[PDB]
């Protein structure tokens, strides 16, 4: 089981990608926009007691994996996918969302330094236009503390707009 530090506070990344222009010629699979957002650790920590304890990068929108796979998930916009990941010298705790990794008992864990990456991807020949649905897109949490993640990423309002020509 994991114990969170007193005053443990989630870091939320606002996924303010902006306007993403898509051209009919853009090929399926193209990263239409790679947006990088700063992750500012804040001193929150946790430690766990069991080899079965885990930290999980989970995707909270209910959209399925896109036909392309490779962690490119569909969105409410046809032909537009989204892929998330955290970008330091810790490959065991990096990778495309979603993933889950084992934690070492007794190790005091902090939110790692780096950047949160949002990739908007063309997943079909023709793309829709509009705004990605708002809300939580990801949470990075330990087992038993899904309600208090290290890190979340959230779309507010029309922070990500697709404009297909």
Numbering used by the authors: 1 to 87, 89 to 166
Sentences from the study reporting this entry:
Further, their respective tip-adhesive proteins, the adhesins Abp1D and Abp2D, make use of large, distally oriented binding pockets to adhere to glycoproteins like fibrinogen, a wound-healing protein important in CAUTI pathogenesis. We demonstrate that Abp1D and Abp2D RBDs are structurally similar, and each binds fibrinogen and other relevant host glycoproteins important in CAUTI and other infections. These proteins share a common binding mechanism, using a large, distally oriented, and flexible pocket that recognizes a complex glycan receptor.
This R86E mutation abolished Abp2D binding to BSM. To assess whether the reduced-binding R86E mutation modulates the anterior loop opening dynamics, we crystallized the Abp2DRBD R86E protein, resulting in a cuboidal crystal, which was solved at 1.9 Å resolution (8 DKA). The electron density of the anterior loop is sparse, starting at position 86, even though the rest of the protein is well-modeled. Consistent with our hypothesis, the R86E mutant ensemble is characterized by a greater diversity of open and closed distances. Our findings indicate that the R86E null binding phenotype may in part be caused by the flexibility in the anterior loop in addition to the charge difference resulting from arginine to glutamate side mutation.
